[PDB]
């Protein structure tokens, strides 16, 4: 996260760290959506251009964390993966269209002050909140700058951007399964997700029922926090039918 701040304790209790077993390192962010299901970006697991293809046994899920590097004894919980599900139409070849994956845990995780699932949006909440100018919140342990790494979880609030402005900021083909967020050069404020934040949640707090909803997944961006560029996010509601199909079936 670039130009953000230290998270408060328990601020994002759905935040998940995807952790590589060997070598031991941060792979990506992710989010807790039930006691057995974790949501992330497909490209965290599969991206052939960079020779990336992780299997279940390569990874661990670390939940309830705050410190990036510490083993947070009596606070975090570490879970093994039973199965990975990548969207069947995930487009790693062109533009990361449908950049979404689910992970089922081997055992349910116990909820605590530090561990709690986020809501997934219904059509109405999505329609209400996914509007240009409305702000969401992105969290992660990724890079603090494009070109080091934070001591603890970082947080930044960013406004959703008008689709034509998103489209005009890039040569990459944008789809309805993406949205973009971030400040314009003229707005003064800044901030962005970065490398290592991928797979983490873009959340919004509904003013109707005061619950947090995950509207986006950190997906891609040209550099980090560049003037005139924006962060792109997987549009969670647009892919919720696939999400429900996987959880229903498996």
């Amino acid at each position: 996260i670039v130009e953000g701040s230290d998270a408060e304790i328990g601020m994002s209790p759905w935040q998940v760290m995807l952790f590589r077993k060997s070598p031991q390192e941060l792979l990506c962010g992710a989010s807790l959506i039930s006691d057995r299901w974790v949501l992330t970006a497909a490209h965290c697991l599969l991206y052939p251009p960079w020779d990336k293809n992780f299997t279940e046994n390569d990874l661990l899920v670390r939940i309830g964390k705050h410190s990036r590097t510490r083993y947070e004894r009596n606070i975090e919980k570490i879970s093994m993966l039973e199965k990975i599900y990548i969207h069947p139409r995930y487009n790693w070849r062109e533009n990361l269209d449908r950049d979404i994956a689910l992970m089922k845990l081997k055992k349910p995780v116990a909820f605590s002050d530090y561990i709690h699932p986020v809501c997934l949006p219904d059509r109405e909440t999505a329609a209400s909140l996914l509007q240009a100018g409305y702000k969401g919140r992105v969290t992660g342990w990724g890079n603090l700058k494009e070109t080091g790494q934070p001591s603890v979880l970082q947080v930044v609030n960013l406004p959703i951007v008008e689709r034509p402005v998103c489209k005009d900021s890039t040569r990459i083909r944008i789809t309805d399964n993406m949205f973009c967020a971030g400040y314009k050069p003229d707005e003064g404020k800044r901030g962005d997700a970065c490398e290592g934040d991928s797979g983490g949640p873009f959340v919004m707090k509904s003013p109707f029922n005061n619950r947090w909803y995950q509207m986006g997944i950190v997906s891609w961006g040209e550099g980090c926090d560049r003037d005139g560029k924006y962060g792109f996010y997987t549009h969670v509601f647009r892919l919720k039918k696939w999400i429900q199909k996987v959880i229903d079936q498996f």
């Binding site: 969401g136 919004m204 619950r211």
Partner: peptide, 27 residues
């Protein structure tokens, strides 16, 4: 059923330091 309600914030009726920024943007 209990999704999206944080033990250390909503469940205790405490707000975090910047959630009001989000609310103020929801016009």
């Amino acid at each position: 059923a209990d999704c999206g309600l944080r033990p250390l914030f909503e469940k205790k009726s405490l707000e975090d330091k910047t959630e009001r920024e989000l609310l103020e943007s929801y016009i």
